[PDB]
Design an enzyme around this catalytic site. Sequence first.
Site, mmCIF file in Angstrom:
data_model
loop_
_atom_site.group_PDB
_atom_site.id
_atom_site.type_symbol
_atom_site.label_atom_id
_atom_site.label_comp_id
_atom_site.label_asym_id
_atom_site.label_seq_id
_atom_site.Cartn_x
_atom_site.Cartn_y
_atom_site.Cartn_z
ATOM 1 N N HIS A 192 60.871 1.986 20.234
ATOM 2 C CA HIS A 192 61.996 1.435 19.497
ATOM 3 C C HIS A 192 61.802 1.324 17.994
ATOM 4 C CE1 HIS A 192 63.318 0.853 23.507
ATOM 5 N NE2 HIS A 192 62.427 -0.089 23.760
ATOM 6 N N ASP A 208 66.346 5.805 24.866
ATOM 7 C CA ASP A 208 65.840 4.771 23.985
ATOM 8 C C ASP A 208 67.073 3.927 23.660
ATOM 9 O OD1 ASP A 208 64.994 3.289 21.609
ATOM 10 O OD2 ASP A 208 63.268 4.647 21.582
ATOM 11 N N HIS A 209 67.316 2.887 24.457
ATOM 12 C CA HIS A 209 68.498 2.048 24.256
ATOM 13 C C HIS A 209 68.698 1.450 22.855
ATOM 14 C CE1 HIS A 209 65.813 -1.293 25.293
ATOM 15 N NE2 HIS A 209 66.770 -2.145 24.970
HETATM 16 O O1 LIG Z 1 66.951 -6.333 22.575
HETATM 17 P P1 LIG Z 1 66.848 -5.823 23.956
HETATM 18 O O2 LIG Z 1 67.635 -4.587 24.187
HETATM 19 O O3 LIG Z 1 66.857 -6.858 25.019
HETATM 20 O O4 LIG Z 1 65.363 -5.185 24.013
HETATM 21 C C1 LIG Z 1 64.211 -5.960 24.400
HETATM 22 C C2 LIG Z 1 63.531 -5.306 25.592
HETATM 23 O O5 LIG Z 1 63.324 -3.914 25.258
HETATM 24 C C3 LIG Z 1 62.747 -3.153 26.332
HETATM 25 O O6 LIG Z 1 62.546 -1.866 25.863
HETATM 26 C C4 LIG Z 1 61.399 -3.754 26.758
HETATM 27 O O7 LIG Z 1 60.869 -3.026 27.855
HETATM 28 C C5 LIG Z 1 61.557 -5.230 27.130
HETATM 29 O O8 LIG Z 1 60.285 -5.794 27.430
HETATM 30 C C6 LIG Z 1 62.200 -5.970 25.954
HETATM 31 O O9 LIG Z 1 62.421 -7.333 26.293
#
Ligand SMILES: O=P(O)(O)OC[C@H]1O[C@@H](O)[C@H](O)[C@@H](O)[C@@H]1O
Lengths: 485, 485
Positions: A240, A177-178
């Site tokens: 998220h 989960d980044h």
């Molecule tokens: O803020 P960040 O890290 O770009 O995260 C947005 C992205 O998060 C990802 O988890 C989604 O799959 C994408 O659709 C989304 O655009």
Amino acid sequence: VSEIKTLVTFFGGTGDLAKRKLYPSVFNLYKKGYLQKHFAIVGTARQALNDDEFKQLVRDSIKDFTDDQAQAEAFIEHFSYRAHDVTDAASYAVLKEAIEEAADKFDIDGNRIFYMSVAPRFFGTIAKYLKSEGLLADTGYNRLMIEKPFGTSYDTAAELQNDLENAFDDNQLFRIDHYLGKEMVQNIAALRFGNPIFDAAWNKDYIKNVQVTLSEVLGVEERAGYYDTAGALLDMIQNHTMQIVGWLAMEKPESFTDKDIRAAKNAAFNALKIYDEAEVNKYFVRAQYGAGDSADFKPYLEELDVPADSKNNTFIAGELQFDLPRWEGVPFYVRSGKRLAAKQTRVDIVFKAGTFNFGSEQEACEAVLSIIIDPKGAIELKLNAKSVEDAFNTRTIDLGWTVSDEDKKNTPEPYERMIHDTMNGDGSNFADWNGVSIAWKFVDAISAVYTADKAPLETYKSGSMGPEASDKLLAANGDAWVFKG
Amino acid sequence: VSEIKTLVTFFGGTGDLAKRKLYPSVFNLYKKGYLQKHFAIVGTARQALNDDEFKQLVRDSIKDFTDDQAQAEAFIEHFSYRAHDVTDAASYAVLKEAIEEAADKFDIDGNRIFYMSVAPRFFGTIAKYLKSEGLLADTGYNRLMIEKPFGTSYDTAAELQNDLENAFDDNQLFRIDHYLGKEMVQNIAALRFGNPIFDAAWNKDYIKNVQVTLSEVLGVEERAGYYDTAGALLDMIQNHTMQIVGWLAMEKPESFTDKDIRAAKNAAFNALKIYDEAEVNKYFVRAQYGAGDSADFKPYLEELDVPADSKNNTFIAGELQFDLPRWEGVPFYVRSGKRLAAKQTRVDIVFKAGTFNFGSEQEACEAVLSIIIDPKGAIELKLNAKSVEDAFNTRTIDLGWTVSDEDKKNTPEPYERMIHDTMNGDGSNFADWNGVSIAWKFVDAISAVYTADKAPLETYKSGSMGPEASDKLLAANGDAWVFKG
Ligand SMILES: O=P(O)(O)OC[C@H]1O[C@@H](O)[C@H](O)[C@@H](O)[C@@H]1O
Ligand SMILES: O=P(O)(O)OC[C@H]1O[C@@H](O)[C@H](O)[C@@H](O)[C@@H]1O
Ligand SMILES: [Ca+2]
Ligand SMILES: [Ca+2]
């Protein structure tokens, strides 16, 4: 620094994520002196590639991250490739060979990490054969990194959990989960627990409401095929958003070890209420973007691969309730959507207004603690002060802080944090089964309603912060979204 | 706005304070639409002057504050002068005439304010004759504005109080203290009471220590004759510093009326401990400046009018103790001196460090709330956050706010606030007898020691923030001055 002795196997080692995020992240750990002699990276996928050919793929991934070529070439000597069908038990013997060949060459005593950057249907299969075909190290550790998504419903999540549980223990399973791997998000605990004035105030007697915002200015762009079936609900909310809410809703831990951290978070998750058809309509709002004021900003239904009768949600907003003494009656608002006013990921803690009568016209208003995560980290605190008027009167002032340039490019990107943390056995910035099961139960109740269409689908102009219902939702409890655009 | 109907009599109407601060302040109240038709200003002093001649003196005072000359000329028509010996009872009849002449001309029903910008020895005499010679209005209000200083010791203060009490009630006596009339100082109550997170934390369970700093970069310059006998102790500590401490130490009032405000402050003053010879040596530090690194910055003993054997204090620092449940054991540090590192008047609330073990190398440190009053208003808040490192660790970040240009020249200067407040009968930003008596008892105990020289006189280089003893004083309780220069 202290050398990290580990062996990492990348399933789907030829994919875009591997090239764009995984290898560069690993390269940085080498640049930072963590990875030295005792480490190896075995790539694997379905395509055929020479060890010579794979090294060039890696050489390309890090091109933009390369300063001294001799440094890059030294890193690249730790890479090997093996073509492989993940559904073939006999083929795993070839993979075990490459892994043990590497273990010998660089002298690594176990410590294996298996990363799966493959389609979600291969997760269970792979995990099974790592154990049965003897790929798990007999010494050191064995950890599995599961990519997003971990299921598409509670049922499918549970199945995955069961399959994985057949070869690993829960504490060896690192779910990606980044967002949880973002530096600013990890500041939440420091701000709360690190400062008594906030620690003793992180409860119902002080907070009026809490807001979580994952705003995006982009539309579906190209991933419309997969997106049309997921929507904002499963794409941003379930994963998220809920995990950020977990860091905010958690109880005070008994220590800062990942074990206690999760116990504290789970205590809150176990108190989260699950809604029925009626409650969903009252507490949640779903919507999809139409055209903005610009012809260039076309509606969702005009995007490539989107069906003309789609009732999919490109925006979600709603109220969460935690049946815990600590959050009794305190609303947790969350929102995430595409084609909004601005890219922003922030948390807003709205404190209750004071009741001290100053005799003034404008009495004390509610204080706000904001933690901006994206695009650039910043911390703001709105406090009550005196107006520059003759008759005594109050007003709100904003105290602010922003990450310096020194802080900025010195900060670790999410993928580096996750890989690094997995190598260290720190699950603090990772979601556990209990958290994931609850988030799924929460989202399923909502999805059932939407799937049956027993709730309205609102609309909003591309560029706003959502439909007007989003505002009405908060107004009912006497609240308002802090971030206006 | 609502018109202010009042009649003001200025004793010492030809002095520098009157020209430089008093008249311009009154002129502003005219410019702001407060003073309109029903108001008159009667100047009075020992010098002979035509009504024509006095008007030119006033015309000069406001020259730099004049935009439209026709506006100035209209204001000036409300001024009259009368030469007068304040020690002559028969001469008061001439003054009563001018006052009643003015009351008729502009149609003012009582509402008289008597300002005394004369030497402190004339205070009692003047007050006596205002009553006996019939100058007090029979209708409306009658208020007396006493200039600094209100005594030079508790004994002399009490005498003055007695003399004044013979003609007025305590609530009609407005003691001047320009620091209490500073916009930023008046923010203290708004920040505390206006924000529950601070209100509930303004006590011993949250605060480690409190710091008050009235730093000056100037030396004695020209007022050395009077200064050599007063020192920083009576010049800045007794008056300005103690009153700022009063706003900080006060209890929570029952309302924001000046009556309750003072009750709350007095509750703290009545708990302030008075020191003996031994305690003074331990808790307080006195010092006088020597030469800095620049030859231009000559020592105190080389200043004009300063005696070569002077043991006078040009700098004072010390710890205050309040025997109240709320401040049990919390040190209140104060400091004020000349020839220091920078001009600054600020308050620093140092909160206690948290005990939440993060497992990190650098654990949570103490948070700090700073309120900068001079030279420019600003509010800063130091909080604990996460360091931009790989291993979890905490650090301190500074959130800040500064008054805008819109706020700056729109803010009322102290003298305007005081005069205006006296016209409104608001004693909120004024010291009362109870506060002044205590401050005097506190300072007398200290002065007795110094006068007897039973305490050392430290030294410091012109440009530093004081002698090293100032630091040692805090180090003993494990504290340190926040403002370093
Ligand atoms: O803020 P960040 O890290 O770009 O995260 C947005 C992205 O998060 C990802 O988890 C989604 O799959 C994408 O659709 C989304 O655009
Ligand atoms: O900050 P301000 O208002 O200039 O106050 C400093 C002055 O305050 C006055 O009260 C003192 O008599 C002066 O000696 C001193 O310089
Ligand atoms: Ca409600
Ligand atoms: Ca002590």
